[PDB]
Amino acid sequence: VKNSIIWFRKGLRLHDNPALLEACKDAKHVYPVFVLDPHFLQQKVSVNRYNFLLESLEDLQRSFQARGSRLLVLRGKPEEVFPRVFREWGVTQLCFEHDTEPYAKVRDAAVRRLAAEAGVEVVTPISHTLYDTDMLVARNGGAAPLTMQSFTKLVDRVGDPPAPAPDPPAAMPPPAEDMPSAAPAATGVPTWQEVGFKEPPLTVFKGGETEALARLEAAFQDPKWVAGFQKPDTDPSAWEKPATTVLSPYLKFGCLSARLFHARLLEVYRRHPAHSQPPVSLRGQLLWREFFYTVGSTTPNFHRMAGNPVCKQIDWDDNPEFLAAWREARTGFPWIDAIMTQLVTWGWMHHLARHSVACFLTRGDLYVSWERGMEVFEEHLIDQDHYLNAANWMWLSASAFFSQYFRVYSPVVFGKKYDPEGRFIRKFLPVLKDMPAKYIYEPWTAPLEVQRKAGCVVGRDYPAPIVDHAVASKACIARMAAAYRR
Numbered sequence: 347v348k349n350s351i352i353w354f355r356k357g358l359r360l361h362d363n364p365a366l367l368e369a370c371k372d373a374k375h376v377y378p379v380f381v382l383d384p385h386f387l388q389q390k391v392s393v394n395r396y397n398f399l400l401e402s403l404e405d406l407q408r409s410f411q412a413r414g415s416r417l418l419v420l421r422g423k424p425e426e427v428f429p430r431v432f433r434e435w436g437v438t439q440l441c442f443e444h445d446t447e448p449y450a451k452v453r454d455a456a457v458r459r460l461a462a463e464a465g466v467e468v469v470t471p472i473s474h475t476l477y478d479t480d481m482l483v484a485r486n487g488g489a490a491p492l493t494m495q496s497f498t499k500l501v502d503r504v505g506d507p508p509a510p511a512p513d514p515p516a517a518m519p520p521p522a523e524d525m526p527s528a529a530p531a532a533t534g535v536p537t538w539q540e541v542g543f544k545e546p547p548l549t550v551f552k553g554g555e556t557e558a559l560a561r562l563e564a565a566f567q568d569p570k571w572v573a574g575f576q577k578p579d580t581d582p583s584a585w586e587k588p589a590t591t592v593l594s595p596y597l598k599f600g601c602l603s604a605r606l607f608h609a610r611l612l613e614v615y616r617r618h619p620a621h622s623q624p625p626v627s628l629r630g631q632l633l634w635r636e637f638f639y640t641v642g643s644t645t646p647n648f649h650r651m652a653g654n655p656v657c658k659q660i661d662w663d664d665n666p667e668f669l670a671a672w673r674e675a676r677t678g679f680p681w682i683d684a685i686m687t688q689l690v691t692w693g694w695m696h697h698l699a700r701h702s703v704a705c706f707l708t709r710g711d712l713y714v715s716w717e718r719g720m721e722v723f724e725e726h727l728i729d730q731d732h733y734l735n736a737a738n739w740m741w742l743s744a745s746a747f748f749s750q751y752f753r754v755y756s757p758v759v760f761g762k763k764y765d766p767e768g769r770f771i772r773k774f775l776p777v778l779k780d781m782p783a784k785y786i787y788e789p790w791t792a793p794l795e796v797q798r799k800a801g802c803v804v805g806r807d808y809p810a811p812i813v814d815h816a817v818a819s820k821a822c823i824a825r826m827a828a829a830y831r832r
């Protein structure tokens with residue numbers, strides 16, 4: 347007979363899940379399995395992203411229960427758990443989505459060795475990305491592109507990505523009854539309290555396939571806004587209705603298929619001929635995700651500076667005092683501090699909002715290593731992607747891809763061009779909710795009578811700026827000019 351296991355790691359979805367379709371095909375019993383390490387916290391990971399994962403698991407549970415099946419959340423390590431449940435369930439086929447991360451390449455190779463000793467067929471289709479990222483490197487001549495423009499000409503030379511896979515059947519083969527490793531009490535979806543978290547999640551984005559599909563349709567409600575999407579022109583101070591899709595947390599965990607997103611964009615572009623072109627287009631943003639995934643998978647030490655053949659070697663400063671002030675939203679700059687507050691509260695910021703805080707920490711003012719700022723973003727970002735966090739932090743640090751260090755964002759005037767009233771700052775920094783808009787970006791420039799009337803006195807209620815931008819910026823630019831002379 348056929349008893350199949352569909353292993354979920356990314357790909358927390360049912361639409362366009364080619365590995366799920368192979369598992370359910372001709373199967374007598376299907377075992378949807380998610381491997382959960384109960385000692386992860388005893389290793390880093392905030393409760394916002396982790397509950398986003400748990401909420402995303404509850405969506406598959408309701409989806410599997412609606413189709414006559416059931417999601418099995420197994421505890422332990424895949425290498426210890428899979429050899430047991432193989433012979434316990436009589437497994438003949440194991441399917442899971444292909445992953446190109448460094449840890450995943452070591453982990454899947456081990457499970458491939460374990461399934462071969464148990465006589466289990468391993469099937470790993472690609473759907474997390476748009477294309478076969480190995481086929482991109484082969485058709486390019488054996489090397490990955492290092493520019494978006496060279497990368498854009500490659501995927502256009504290949505053609506359209508594969509269409510999204512059809513929906514799975516409405517009735518799935520259930521797991522076999524009376525199995526010890528599939529007990530409901532041991533395979534239930536845990537809560538954030540039970541996994542060992544004290545504080546509740548404060549984010550506003552609910553995880554799951556249902557939420558990803560609903561947010562997708564809401565974005566395509568206005569095809570005019572979809573076709574004319576230009577990324578650098580979006581508003582980073584828009585928090586009530588963000589100026590972008592905010593689909594990154596769902597694309598990270600796999601709740602939303604990238605090929606589903608791409609084929610929906612083509613439906614709009616075919617009717618809107620003056621639509622935006624890459625890289626500023628909405629497709630182009632998906633191509634950024636496809637571009638960084640291709641280079642990082644073929645580049646050694648991509649999440650680090652040393653040993654990285656594409657990262658410029660820069661003698662970043664070790665200043666724990668600036669790092670503590672930047673990660674704790676106490677830099678004295680309300681524009682930077684409000685964004686770092688939105689990071690720990692929502693887990694998501696606008697792309698240009700991440701630009702201001704990343705530039706300020708590195709090549710802009712504090713000259714702290716981009717690696718240290720990436721660790722802070724790995725923990726709180728609900729859309730944390732290993733290849734994407736890394737390449738975008740080397741961009742903002744002028745270490746790779748980007749090399750125009752002379753462009754330094756002003757932590758005072760950047761947010762003023764979009765929000766002169768400071769509506770963004772007053773929401774996340776309520777200590778300045780009464781400060782007049784004339785001094786809300788520069789609280790140290792307000793007279794002491796205005797500071798008391800507004801209820802916010804610099805130094806007692808709000809910290810003074812840790813640096814003078816004109817002095818700090820002038821020092822960081824000169825150092826990067828001497829380093830880029832290497």
Ligand SMILES: Cc1cc2nc3c(=O)[nH]c(=O)nc-3n(C[C@H](O)[C@H](O)[C@H](O)COP(=O)(O)OP(=O)(O)OC[C@H]3O[C@@H](n4cnc5c(N)ncnc54)[C@H](O)[C@@H]3O)c2cc1C
Pocket residue numbers: 577590591592593594595597598631632634635638695696697698700701704723727729730731732734735736738739742
């Ligand atoms: C320092 C820094 C760190 C970042 N870390 C991450 C990260 O860990 N995870 C992450 O998903 N993105 C990361 N980004 C990219 C970008 O900031 C986010 O993808 C974007 O804010 C997500 O909003 P959205 O979903 O509304 O994007 P949209 O503009 O609506 O774009 C749609 C999708 O395209 C992709 N995309 C958009 N911009 C980029 C980009 N610059 N690079 C790669 N893919 C992109 C995402 O999957 C996104 O969901 C980072 C950028 C910076 C500057």
Ligand SMILES: [Cl-]
Pocket residue numbers: 754755756759760
């Ligand atoms: Cl600016």
